Amino acid sequence: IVGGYTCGANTVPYQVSLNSGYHFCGGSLIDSQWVVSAAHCYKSGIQVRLGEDNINVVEGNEQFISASKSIVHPSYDSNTLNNDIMLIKLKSAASLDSRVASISLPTSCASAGTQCLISGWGNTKSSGTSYPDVLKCLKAPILSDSSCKSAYPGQITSNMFCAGYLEGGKDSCQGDSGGPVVCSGKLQGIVSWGSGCAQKNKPGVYTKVCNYVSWIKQTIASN
């Protein structure tokens, strides 16, 4: 997250960290035993870290749970990043409280203009590199359909949307991938891709979660 603020410890209670020995992706908790992330964050051997702020210190509210199975979206295309979404089941149910809670799936897609919260432990610099230990937050609007397509000609599909600032300076970045875009108390997006970070005219692109509700709910009822 570039141009963001320190969220505050456990104030994004649905944010999770995917650790394979180090944090590499973000995710969102959607129930006691299921996490949603970005398919391009898939790897064998994941541990899900819940209740994290500082990801290099044990502060007393963490739950570390191993993944029992991962399910990449059937139609994920890793060359164009369409359907960049995956599901992770946890080996045991998380214990939910005020500091570890799930976020709600949308019933309706969110419109352009809507202000959302984006969070993660990715790089905080637009040029060069500096990774924060504590979670960072950014409020950003969903951009029009049109604007998103003219910023990335030929690359935006019906399952992506852009959010951020076309003036630059505020954006998601490397290490934020798979993390939540929450708008009016629900999960509208997943940090998926962009062109550098916080460049003029190139806003971050997110997986449109509203298009996948049906698939998630069918998948978690049978697995």
mmCIF file of N, CA and C in Angstrom, residues 7-15 50-54 59-63 97-101 121 134-135 137:
data_model
loop_
_atom_site.group_PDB
_atom_site.id
_atom_site.type_symbol
_atom_site.label_atom_id
_atom_site.label_comp_id
_atom_site.label_asym_id
_atom_site.label_seq_id
_atom_site.Cartn_x
_atom_site.Cartn_y
_atom_site.Cartn_z
ATOM 1 N N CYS A 7 -3.398 1.196 9.817
ATOM 2 C CA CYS A 7 -4.827 0.918 10.102
ATOM 3 C C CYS A 7 -5.136 0.985 11.633
ATOM 4 N N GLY A 8 -4.202 0.402 12.367
ATOM 5 C CA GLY A 8 -4.377 0.203 13.816
ATOM 6 C C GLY A 8 -4.570 -1.312 14.019
ATOM 7 N N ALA A 9 -3.946 -1.752 15.121
ATOM 8 C CA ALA A 9 -3.964 -3.199 15.468
ATOM 9 C C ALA A 9 -5.416 -3.803 15.540
ATOM 10 N N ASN A 10 -5.662 -4.800 14.692
ATOM 11 C CA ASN A 10 -6.872 -5.655 14.647
ATOM 12 C C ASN A 10 -8.120 -4.871 14.241
ATOM 13 N N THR A 11 -7.932 -3.727 13.629
ATOM 14 C CA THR A 11 -9.112 -2.923 13.185
ATOM 15 C C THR A 11 -9.672 -3.353 11.817
ATOM 16 N N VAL A 12 -9.000 -4.296 11.193
ATOM 17 C CA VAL A 12 -9.420 -4.955 9.948
ATOM 18 C C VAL A 12 -9.447 -6.448 10.308
ATOM 19 N N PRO A 13 -10.434 -6.880 10.996
ATOM 20 C CA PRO A 13 -10.428 -8.209 11.637
ATOM 21 C C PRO A 13 -10.543 -9.424 10.724
ATOM 22 N N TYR A 14 -10.984 -9.158 9.497
ATOM 23 C CA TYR A 14 -11.096 -10.171 8.406
ATOM 24 C C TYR A 14 -9.810 -10.304 7.558
ATOM 25 N N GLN A 15 -8.850 -9.393 7.731
ATOM 26 C CA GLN A 15 -7.581 -9.472 6.985
ATOM 27 C C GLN A 15 -6.758 -10.699 7.466
ATOM 28 N N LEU A 50 -4.038 -15.312 11.163
ATOM 29 C CA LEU A 50 -5.254 -14.535 11.567
ATOM 30 C C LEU A 50 -4.935 -13.721 12.794
ATOM 31 N N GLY A 51 -5.579 -12.594 12.846
ATOM 32 C CA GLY A 51 -5.334 -11.713 14.026
ATOM 33 C C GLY A 51 -3.972 -11.025 14.136
ATOM 34 N N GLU A 52 -3.362 -10.867 12.939
ATOM 35 C CA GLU A 52 -2.035 -10.225 12.780
ATOM 36 C C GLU A 52 -2.142 -8.708 12.600
ATOM 37 N N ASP A 53 -1.152 -8.043 13.232
ATOM 38 C CA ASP A 53 -0.821 -6.608 12.975
ATOM 39 C C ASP A 53 0.665 -6.654 12.542
ATOM 40 N N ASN A 54 1.500 -6.687 13.547
ATOM 41 C CA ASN A 54 2.872 -6.736 13.214
ATOM 42 C C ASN A 54 3.109 -8.198 12.881
ATOM 43 N N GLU A 59 2.086 -10.708 19.245
ATOM 44 C CA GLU A 59 1.483 -9.645 20.044
ATOM 45 C C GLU A 59 0.353 -10.170 20.892
ATOM 46 N N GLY A 60 -0.113 -11.415 20.669
ATOM 47 C CA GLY A 60 -1.123 -11.967 21.574
ATOM 48 C C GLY A 60 -2.444 -12.095 20.930
ATOM 49 N N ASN A 61 -2.668 -11.699 19.702
ATOM 50 C CA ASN A 61 -4.040 -12.059 19.182
ATOM 51 C C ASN A 61 -4.033 -12.973 17.946
ATOM 52 N N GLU A 62 -2.846 -13.474 17.624
ATOM 53 C CA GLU A 62 -2.786 -14.357 16.451
ATOM 54 C C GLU A 62 -3.431 -15.776 16.569
ATOM 55 N N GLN A 63 -3.904 -16.260 15.433
ATOM 56 C CA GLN A 63 -4.305 -17.670 15.257
ATOM 57 C C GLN A 63 -3.566 -18.123 13.996
ATOM 58 N N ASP A 97 -13.921 -13.656 17.249
ATOM 59 C CA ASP A 97 -14.136 -12.612 18.310
ATOM 60 C C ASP A 97 -14.109 -11.244 17.575
ATOM 61 N N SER A 98 -13.905 -10.223 18.325
ATOM 62 C CA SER A 98 -13.932 -8.848 17.873
ATOM 63 C C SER A 98 -12.723 -8.526 17.005
ATOM 64 N N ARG A 99 -11.627 -9.250 17.216
ATOM 65 C CA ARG A 99 -10.322 -8.913 16.602
ATOM 66 C C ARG A 99 -10.066 -9.832 15.378
ATOM 67 N N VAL A 100 -10.819 -10.974 15.337
ATOM 68 C CA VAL A 100 -10.845 -12.043 14.280
ATOM 69 C C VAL A 100 -12.338 -12.373 14.018
ATOM 70 N N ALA A 101 -12.715 -11.904 12.850
ATOM 71 C CA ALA A 101 -14.070 -11.957 12.317
ATOM 72 C C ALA A 101 -14.079 -12.094 10.781
ATOM 73 N N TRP A 121 0.072 -5.738 3.742
ATOM 74 C CA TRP A 121 1.450 -5.564 4.210
ATOM 75 C C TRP A 121 2.383 -5.478 2.985
ATOM 76 N N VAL A 134 3.641 -3.654 10.094
ATOM 77 C CA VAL A 134 2.225 -3.547 10.610
ATOM 78 C C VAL A 134 1.249 -3.305 9.438
ATOM 79 N N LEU A 135 -0.007 -3.634 9.605
ATOM 80 C CA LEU A 135 -0.916 -3.508 8.477
ATOM 81 C C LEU A 135 -1.170 -2.043 8.056
ATOM 82 N N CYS A 137 -3.555 0.674 5.506
ATOM 83 C CA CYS A 137 -4.885 0.918 4.964
ATOM 84 C C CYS A 137 -4.953 2.066 3.955
#
